[model samples]
Target chain A: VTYEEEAVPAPVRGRLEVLSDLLYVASPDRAMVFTRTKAETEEIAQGLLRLGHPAQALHGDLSQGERERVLGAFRQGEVRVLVATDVAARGLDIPQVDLVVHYRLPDRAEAYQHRSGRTGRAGRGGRVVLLYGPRERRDVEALERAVGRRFKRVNPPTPEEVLEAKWRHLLARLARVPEKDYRLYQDFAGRLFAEGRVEVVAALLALLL
Target chain B: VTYEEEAVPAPVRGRLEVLSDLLYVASPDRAMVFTRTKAETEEIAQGLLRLGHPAQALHGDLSQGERERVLGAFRQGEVRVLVATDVAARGLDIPQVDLVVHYRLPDRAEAYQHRSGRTGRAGGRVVLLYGPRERRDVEALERAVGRRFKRVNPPTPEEVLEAKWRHLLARLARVPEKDYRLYQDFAGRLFAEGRVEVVAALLALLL
Candidate 1:
């Protein structure tokens, strides 16, 4: 388990920005953000999606059919992040969540243990990222004592680091493009380079991202 | 419904202090504070209690028996404020909540309708107080559109309003002092008056 401790600048909107940055730095295959309110499940999911992650909100407010559809998407790996209220996560059956972010601290140490259990137990280890606000310093201490785990308190990735981290994602996607498909694109790419304008390439990359 | 627009001084911890201060200033006989978390049910309940209101936490963390006990206290006048999560408050059987404070605004307007329903439908009016932070100015508008009720946006009561508000409580308590009890106190008052020791009287008041 690891916790990043950068004091929240605004404590409202700023907290979500920090969370999305943390997710970007981590860049897990499948992540779950656990929050306190049903309202936050929607808010946090939208925030992650704006950061351009395929995320979904899971809560009791959704109908049974909607719940099934949402869960199916997660199981099929169509959705990478699930921002869930504790109630909705209580009976989650999806397997092998790679990362779990405590968007807000759970009420109990037992709750924390239960959250970490969702990540993985298939003889493979998983990571737990705890996001706490500035005033939660003492709470992080209390959590460490109660949960019997020492969290490596670290700095959150800065905005600059996030812009840098996007290349890893960009390159991975680029690596998957077959030579058959890339020849057609590379012909156009060479023409863009023929223009010798970095701004043109930069603008193309911006829209692509 | 009313929304108090006081920009929060600090966001995390200051929000609770502001809510408690608002509770003190808008001192209702019975109140319900609806929050977003089970953890805050305990935190805000403890906050209101420290401010001298008889408040209790009601949340899913409490067992059915404890939930029953907490509800009974609220219904029986032993408790005034119930700091509750929406899930725990879903099946509330008791009624006559004089005031409802939205500690955190719910996700939907339908949810707000259900929360206000807990107050009363038995012909008595109720007040809904929303404690919104500086950032929530926009959200408060969105809430009004969805709920179809315009909220009275006003400044929160000042510290001076609260400090001086205590005198009515003092005088009301003082009025209950009967002729039987008055003789005992008036004898002391007479002696103190004879001494003309205003400093001594002032010291008594200071303590």
Candidate 2:
């Protein structure tokens, strides 16, 4: 699983494009995104949609039934991206996520650690990207103290970088499969070509892609 | 005004006799006795009765109406010894009390100063007595602090000495009087030809 999401502000579309490309190239099986509010979650989901990445919102005000449905979809691979609050950021047992994206700075160092702990489980390598504005540098320092690690700073991904990320994401998703299984999906892959419409194949591929 | 009654216990009675005798020998126009409780106030009133001293109890538990009656009686010279608690012990502007007996030790040292202050007023000699068990010795030591004062240990006067005290008390009660008007009721000599009859008159004098 790989958890990735858009950063703050629609103006960060370029950054989102870059992130999507990286996550795509990473080809993580799943991705988790943490947002501070329902509105922010929806906004991030919209950006992911624009980038053609599957994403969903999770927050407190959702009806209990609706929240359960959303959670089930994300866990079952029906959805590829989950943007949630602090409630979902910690104590969750989801594993196989290769990346965790914190779309907004948490209030305190503890919350930051909890949000980022979602990934890097079960001896798997994981990456956490913490985004902060000028006002959040002190909190970032405090977070550094709490996690006992320094964050590697990088600029937002460009559109070209995002494009590369998407292909890489497809690859990483299938990294652990035995090579023989590819031929089975490959046969079904041939039927779309036999139908004489690669576009249909593309759409079908998008479901798994 | 004197508020007198009876009921002083034996120990206190002996001390009161010595005091009355001292006051009579050095006669002061008036005197005050303060007790801590109503029961003690009443006890001292009865003791004054046995000693042939005219006194009354000034305690607040009496109803306002009853208190007014007692106060009026004292004001009119119906009594000469005023037995009281601190409630009536203060804010009283009566004149010419020459002695104050703390029949019981005050609960606090300051209370002693306040009660004794009732006398030695307007340039008069004030006498004070502490019974054997008054428990004020420590309180006095505390007040004196760095100051030096003599500590006298003396035995209480009994019946034989009490006779001398009777005359001595009358003299003490008379010494400071510029006029006989206030002491007039108690001025008759203790040894008149029918002084035993005088005792009968004093006993029935409450009437």
Candidate 3:
């Protein structure tokens, strides 16, 4: 796996907060987000979901069809961020993974390379990001030494970068949306219009952005 | 009694928003916001309340102590925006009026001079602001005041968000523990739900 390794440097329960920030900053057309535990994989994936972007979860529990269906979506780019734990992703392969995010560092360097090494196919440039609290810098360093590569530290994007990058992501997002697909939601949008309150309208736009 | 006149603006139905916008941009020590109708006085006063300023309404109906208490709040600086109609403000005196906003310009020049004239007793400024459809009235007021009025746009969303977000966060910090105790659990639960959009919703509220 040949991919660029970089880190956002922060930690734990609030770990969930930065995922969307990464979603916008990376603006990945198709990617994988890794977490440590089975429960957390589901948390990160179900949690990645908003009416904004739909990402599905894959863990140790899904049956053949469920796993295949999940992967099918990722390969098709319908599921932009496929969140999985180490066990679920162990022997699996998904094509064209433009980015890989480690939500929490895996316990061993072997597992670390297993996740990051797989994404960048050498077919094109790929990006792998590691997000950790200040304390986890030690684990990241240990993985760095074992993996035989240095991890580049990146500061979070500036406010303007966040807006413009996120804005750029959205233009492509809306551009690809099919005309027939948009009709399914016209009634829903008009329903919001019918409410006749600008607050709700602005609130929807606010959350959406 | 002395005040400054300026305009920080928006439109009809959504006018409620810019009222709060004006409150922050002006950052007035204490001010009076004048609207056209008596009922509109309440609308503007009530609308200005949530932006962290206590704005009271004064109209034609209030009598004796009702009017006195409202004026008392304004005089003491306890009330920040005193929204009133023209009829209620005649012959009434208030002190240290830092700003007077003509939310809607009065019909006749005497009323315009009456509202604009009274505020700048020592050296206060006045603001004449209304909707685009309402611009025709500005010519009359300009003629009466005999000063060149400058045209300016209202503050942007970024500025409003910046002004309002800090104020709201400070307001949140100041809330006594007992006050928000009821929703305390709900707040904790939202953190657990971990919906990123909810966080955006909250930041939007902060704006």
Candidate 4:
């Protein structure tokens, strides 16, 4: 949990909100947010719940039944966010996870690779978010060197941005398909078209585009 | 590299020579002797060379070209011994390395697995040696736990008689034979027999 003394700008926060929204809409299953410890995972899960986000804490300390229930919820789309620790994180073969947030930096370079590999699987593009505090500069630099990638300092996402992002992702998914295939979803599309004008249709498509 | 102080029985050197003879009679192609440092790898390689055993040293600092040359000689049976630091001693994909001598105890339990994994590959058995100076009882126990195997301090030739233990290890050079019936000859008879036997054979066949 590290950040610079300077507060994250509103624009950055808005962008993150939009990004999270996009990921949320695009994700076919649950999203995983990785933290360093069980305590941190629980804390983040609690925060997400407070914000009305469907989230759960998953760690080795949890009972088998409890862990299974949390996983079940994630699979059924009941829980959209799962905050977890590394031990509980490895060997997980979940698909359709569009976003992976590193709540804390990994202890080793190899661990970072494995953590980030949790997403962007099966040729699907995924967003990996790394959260670092003010004191973590040296470690972040070393990690950046090891991974051969750059990280942009950005603020957390907001509610409105999340809504906009979700719609954009939905339209994007539809736009990739052929018009002939739209006939399958035509009945529902027609109802929405009748209720709204072409701009509304465009907006709906844009939200999902 | 570190040897605990102890009074060696007068006949210990004589016994070592005798054990060395047994290995020689077998005429193994390649041998790996583990030491803690580059200096020790040099010392053991020199010792083997002096004794008319074709030997060489391998270490991290060795140039890739030199390392490859040494490895090539060993594979070709021109060099019978390769004394090396753990950095270069283990994880060798050479099939002809039929013997592994732990001149010094490995730093950890996993290290023993890696060092031993080098030999007993490609259906070959390896002779692993450990020279533990019997002085402190704690040092004896440390060796036992570190290897995850039973240990007898100041190991004798009678104890070494269990050299018949050859593990059958799979070839690291995996060739995909999805439909090659002719390739069965390259596999062991047990592998050619059945899939269950193949699994069992792979597990049971370790050096």
Model 4 lDDT at residue B48? 70
Query: Which numbered prediction scores highest in TM-score against the true structure?
Result: 1
What is the CAPRI rating of model 3's predicted complex? incorrect
| Per-residue alpha-carbon lDDT of candidate 4 for residues A127-148, written as tens digits (9 for 90 to 100) | 6666565566666777878876
Residue A75 CA displacement from its true place in model 1, Å? 2.0
**Of models 1 and 3, which has the larger TM-score?**
1
Error of 1 at B150 (Å): 54
Candidate 3 lDDT tens digits, A8-51: 86545666656676677767777788887778877777677752
Candidate 4, residue B15: how far the Cα is off, in Å: 88
Write model 2 residue lDDT over A110-192, tens digit each, in one string.
Answer: 77667766776456567677766656667776776776766766555665555445534544454544443233234433443
- Using TM-score as the measure, name the better of candidate 2 and candidate 3: 3
Question: How displaced is residue B112 in candidate 1, in Å?
Answer: 43
Tens digit per residue, CA lDDT, model 1, B24-68:
665666777888898888988988788666889988878899888
Tell me how far the alpha carbon of residue A49 in candidate 4 is from the true structure, in angstroms, after superposition: 0.9
Best by lDDT: 3
For candidate 3, the share of real interface contacts preserved is: 0.00
- What range of 10 consecutive residues in model 3 chain B has the weakest lDDT sum? B196-205
True contacts kept of each: 0.00, 0.00, 0.00, 0.00
TM-score (chain B only), all candidates: 0.68, 0.57, 0.73, 0.55
Query: Which of 1 and 2 is the better model by TM-score?
Result: 1
Better of 1 and 2 by lDDT: 1
